[PDB]
Amino acid sequence: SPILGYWKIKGLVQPTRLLLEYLEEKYEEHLYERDEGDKWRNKKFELGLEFPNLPYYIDGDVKLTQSMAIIRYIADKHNMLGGCPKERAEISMLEGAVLDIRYGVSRIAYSKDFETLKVDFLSKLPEMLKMFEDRLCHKTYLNGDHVTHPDFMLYDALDVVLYMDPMCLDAFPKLVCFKKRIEAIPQIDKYLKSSKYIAWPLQGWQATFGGGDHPPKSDLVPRGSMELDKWA
Amino acid sequence: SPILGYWKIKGLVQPTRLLLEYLEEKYEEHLYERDEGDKWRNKKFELGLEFPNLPYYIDGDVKLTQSMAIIRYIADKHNMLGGCPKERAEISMLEGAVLDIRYGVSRIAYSKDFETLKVDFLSKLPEMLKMFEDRLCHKTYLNGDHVTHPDFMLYDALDVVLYMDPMCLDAFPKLVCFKKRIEAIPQIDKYLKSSKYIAWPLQGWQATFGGGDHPPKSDLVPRGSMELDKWA
Ligand SMILES: N[C@H](CCC(=O)N[C@@H](CS)C(=O)NCC(=O)O)C(=O)O
Ligand SMILES: N[C@H](CCC(=O)N[C@@H](CS)C(=O)NCC(=O)O)C(=O)O
């Protein structure tokens, strides 16, 4: 199989994992664990990479790095990246828009003073999401009725964002419908329910959000109602 | 012409600007100025965008947003994105690796306590760059002897990084050779020396680095030599 390295985190790779699955493609993962980072430094220069970074993708021919480079390579192999220039460009538009929410969590995630940051980013969230809620206007998926790589990306993004505020998605039904429809894939279904599936962490174990070492209780403030009532 | 919006900043668009030039492609820019941001909000929802964000690219057919989506669309139109899947994937590997340095400046740029941040990021710089200095091993450019979209990207990245520490590039000759070779293009040459060329800011005018409103003197510390001597 094509060999793939990452940390035992959802992180950047979750979407390529998801995509690898849905294609019924034999792949072998190289999963580094928090302590294991020792093992990384040595192999960091050995396995003939050109831009040695994680996540990596070893194959017969291709010897790749860079998260987009990996995903696009699987979907491209498969005829999913698009036919006609303009379409191919729309796909990456979707990709880009996706990666703002998911990279948006990333760019806050580790900052100690998360609590305060969360606020500002979340303020903007409803706008970013409406974009998709609107693009899901009489669509099964992002870019018509077939899956595309960015569908799993909005999925890793939505999966991520629910961990900030589980309620954030109630204002956008079609998005919730989207998450239900993705998982309804027999391939998505069985996966999320297997040994292989990395359910956490969401970020590197150092991270203030989607981090620590185990699935998330509070670390916060709620707001719910005036004095001592409503505590989500 | 295909119409393109941004701020009167180098920023994200500098590379698409550079690429648009080298292709001898008629384009009309829509450049918003610092005060002008008023004009943005109204047109933000009017001009039939799907993911209304800056930079935008209006054409006959395509109505696009997202910085990668724009660049890749010009080069794709032109047969530059790659022939065979693996190659196309290497291109975006290059793209990705590029965008770590350039996004690396971005993610520090605005933080008030730049001075301190700069340190850490710069620490890592020589590693990131060696990658390219090595990939320039008996190459004219990134990915052989033809230009590719990422060549302008390493250019916008190197152009950017010299503004932190002008010396950072002395350890990597081939990179300096690269910058000389890019600019040697009659199209790059004439451009950088025209009315059209946005020489500054580098970031949004709010930014602590590559910002303010005008080309950069100090705001810093040097280190040069022990007590009061060597002040770069
Ligand atoms: N922009 C990322 C580059 C990767 C990244 O910055 N690396 C992380 C992923 S969690 C890693 O932990 N890097 C360790 C390293 O430098 O060796 C991509 O496209 O994959
Ligand atoms: N990730 C960027 C998205 C753009 C971005 O975050 N926008 C900046 C570029 S300086 C802008 O100022 N945005 C204003 C807006 O939200 O309308 C891309 O691919 O183009």
According to CATH, the topology of domain A81-185 is Glutathione S-transferase Yfyf (Class Pi); Chain A, domain 2 (1.20.1050)
Contact A95 B64 (CB under 8 A): no
Starting at the earlier edge strand, list the strands of the sheet with A3-7: A28-32, A3-7, A56-58, A63-64
Tokens standing for residue A4: 């793939």
PDB experimental method: X-ray
The ligand 1 site (C-beta within 6 Å) comprises A 7, 11-12, 53-55, 66-68, 204; B 96, 100
- Is A81-185 the same fold as A1-80+186-212? no
Query: Does A44 show up as a binding residue in the annotation?
Result: yes
Nearest-CB residue to B89 (from A52, A62, A88): A62
Q: Which of B52, B77, B93 sits opposite A66 (nearest CB)?
A: B93
Q: Which ligand is nearest to the CA of B96?
A: 1
Q: Which of B28, B50, B26, B54 is nearest to B39 (CA)?
A: B54
- CA B158-B154-A74 angle, 5° bins: 150
Residue A110 labeled ligand binder = yes
Tokens of residue A85, six digits = 């220039």
Q: Counting Cβ atoms within 10 Å, is residue B204 exposed (0-12), middle (13-18) or buried (19+)?
A: middle
The Cα B198–Cα B184 span in angstroms is 19
* Contact yes or no for B9/B2 (Cβ under 8 A): no
Say what the resolution is, in angstroms. Answer: 2.5
Q: Say how far apart CA B148 and CA B90 lie, in whole Å.
A: 11
* Domain B1-80+186-212 top-level CATH class: alpha beta
Which atom of ligand 2 approaches the CA of B40 most closely?
17
Q: How far apart are the CA of A53 and the centre of ligand 1, in A?
A: 6
Alpha carbon nearest to ligand 1 atom 5, residue: A54
Alpha helices in chain B (DSSP H): 14-22, 37-46, 67-77, 85-109, 114-135, 149-161, 173-183, 186-192
Verify whether the Cβ–Cβ distance B53 to A86 is below 8 Å: no
Distance in Å, CA B49 to ligand 2 centroid: 14
Q: Which sequence spans correspond to the domains of chain A?
A: 1-80+186-212, 81-185
B65 contacts in A (CB within 8 Å)?
93, 96-97
Residue of B51, B68, B101 to mutate for A, most A C-beta atoms under 10 A? B51
Q: Which atom of ligand 2 is nearest to the CA of B53?
A: 17
Q: Atom 13 of ligand 1 has which residue's CA nearest to it? A: A54
Tell me which of A42, A51, A53 to substitute to probe ligand 1's pocket, judged by most ligand atoms within 8 Å of the beta carbon. A53
B61-64 long-range contacts, CB within 8 A, separation 24+: B61/A86, B62/A86, B62/A89, B62/A90, B64/A89, B64/A90, B64/A93
Do the beta carbons of residue A34 and residue A92 sit within 8 Å?
no
DSSP string, chain A: --EEEEESSSTTTHHHHHHHHHTT---EEEEE-TTTHHHHHHHHHHS--SS--SSEEE-SS-EE-SHHHHHHHHHHHTT-S-SSHHHHHHHHHHHHHHHHHHHHHHHHHTSS-HHHHHHHHHHHHHHHHHHHHHHTTT-SBTTBSS--HHHHHHHHHHHHHTTT-TTTTTT-HHHHHHHHHHHTSHHHHHHHTSSS-----SS-TT-TTTTSSSS----S---SBTTTB---
For residue A65, the chain B residues in CB contact (below 8 A) are 93, 96-97
* Residues whose beta carbon lies within 6 Å of some atom of ligand 2: A 96, 100; B 7, 11-12, 53-55, 66-68, 204
Backbone angles phi, psi at B19, to 5 degrees: -70, -40
Judged by CB atoms closer than 8 Å, whether chains meet at A131 and B51 is answered as yes
Q: Report B:88-147 residues touching A (Cβ under 8 A).
A: 88-90, 92-97, 107, 131, 135
Is B67's Cβ below 8 Å from some Cβ in A?
yes
Cα distance between residue B10 and residue B19, in whole Å: 13
Question: Where is B168: in which H helix or E strand?
Answer: none
| Buried b or exposed e, range B78-96, using 16+ CB within 10 angstroms | eebbbeebbebbbbbbbbb
Chain B, nearest residue to A72 by Cα: B89
Q: Are the C-beta atoms of B131 and B137 separated by less than 8 Å?
A: no
CA distance B158 to B150: 12
Q: Which residues of A touch B94 (CB under 8 A)?
A: 51
CA distance B46 to B132: 42
